[PDB]
């Protein structure tokens, strides 16, 4: 599923991501935009052989099981395929564990490089929330 910008902001808010670990909703929408262009079916293969899955490009090295990332963990206790669902519940629940891991949203290199310190409120401007 390709979300609309305000459609994704509503789904994230409903699942409690708005101001989670102090990150305003525009931070999460900005990260999803640059990670996945709001596509739940986004995938990216990393050089190390791990894969990033879903709207927030969550990686198999630590967070999900895909059966093909030697030495990896599954700390969100999910198949990585769950991260590609039109239902963002698994992505959000796993994002909450990631952003609690110590480095906040720096865990998302695209958030650090393209969202951090920018006017992230523009990502929820005009949305009925
Ligand atoms: Na894994």
Q: What is the CATH number of domain 5-124?
A: 1.10.530.10
Instruction: State the virtual CA torsion across 35, 47, 90, 9 in degrees, nearest 10.
Output: 0
Task: Tell me how far the alpha carbon of residue 78 lies from the centroid of ligand 1, in angstroms.
Answer: 9
Question: Exposed, middle or buried: residue 74 (CB in 10 Å: 0-12, 13-18, 19+)?
Answer: middle
Beta bridge partners of 45: 51
Establish whether 119 is an annotated binding residue. no
DSSP string spanning 49-81? S-EEETTTTEETTTT-B-S-STT---TT-SBGG
Q: What is the resolution of this structure in A?
A: 1.6
For residue 121, what is the DSSP state?
G
d(CA 20, CA 95): 10
Nearest-angstrom CA–CA distance, 3 and 97: 23
Token duo for residue 73: 């963990």
Is 129:15 a contact under the CB 8 Å cutoff? Answer: no
What percent of the residues of the chain are helix, what percent strand, and what percent coil, each to the nearest 5? 40, 10, 45
CA distance 51 to 46: 6
Q: What is the whole-number distance in angstroms between the Cα of residue 42 and the centre of ligand 1?
A: 17
Please give the Cα distance from 85 to 54 (Å, whole number).
8
Q: Give the side-chain half-sphere CA count within 13 A for 71.
A: 3
List the domain boundaries for the chain: 5-124
The dihedral region occupied by 84, where left means phi > 0, alpha psi between -120 and 50, and beta the remainder, is alpha
């Amino acid at each position: 599923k390709v979300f609309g910008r305000c459609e994704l902001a509503a789904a994230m808010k409903r699942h409690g991501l708005d101001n989670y670990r102090g990150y305003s909703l525009g931070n999460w929408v900005c990260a999803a935009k640059f990670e996945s262009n709001f596509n739940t079916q986004a995938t990216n293969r990393n050089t190390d052989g791990s894969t990033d899955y879903g709207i927030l490009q969550i990686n198999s090295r630590w967070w999900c099981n895909d059966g093909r990332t030697p030495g990896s963990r599954n700390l969100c206790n999910i198949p990585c395929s769950a991260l590609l669902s039109s239902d963002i519940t698994a992505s959000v629940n796993c994002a909450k564990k990631i952003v609690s891991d110590g480095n906040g949203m720096n865990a998302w290199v695209a958030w650090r490089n393209r969202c951090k310190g920018t006017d992230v409120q523009a990502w929820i401007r005009g949305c009925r929330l």
